[PDB]
């Protein structure tokens, strides 16, 4: 808590590391959330939802 | 006084100086004096 907190606002190297970590996780969290809502809005329309998938003849 | 060593000065300076607000009182031909944001920014070093 206080240890990381105090380091972030007192050393710019820790703050830059904090920015990189927040960019990395915040980007993945949004990409995960966007894709979950894309899946909920497109039920039945995915390539893996084709009934005849695998029997061409 | 003797108790104030180099570690003491750095500790006290971090409490009173680092990234702290300042008060400015200027008079005269002071157009070239930097503004509040310039003085405010110069209270920390971003290379550390």
């Amino acid at each position: 808590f206080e240890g990381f907190y105090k380091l972030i606002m007192r050393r710019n190297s820790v703050y830059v590391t904090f920015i990189i970590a927040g960019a990395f996780f915040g980007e993945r969290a949004v990409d995960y959330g966007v894709h979950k809502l894309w899946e909920r809005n497109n039920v039945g329309k995915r390539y893996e939802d084709i009934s005849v998938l695998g029997q061409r003849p | 006084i003797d108790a104030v060593d180099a570690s003491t000065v750095k500790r006290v300076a971090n409490k009173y100086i680092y990234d702290k607000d300042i008060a400015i009182s200027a008079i005269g031909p002071i157009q070239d004096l930097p503004d509040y944001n310039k003085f405010r920014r110069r209270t920390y070093w971003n290379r550390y």
Partner: peptide, 28 residues
């Protein structure tokens, strides 16, 4: 202030390398 800052930026650079290049699978 000289070694601490050096280790701190060395950590920032290493995290940045892991962030730009994301070799999640090269941990072998």
């Amino acid at each position: 202030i000289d070694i601490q800052a050096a280790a701190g930026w060395g950590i920032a650079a290493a995290a940045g390398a892991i962030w730009v290049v994301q070799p999640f699978g090269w941990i072998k």
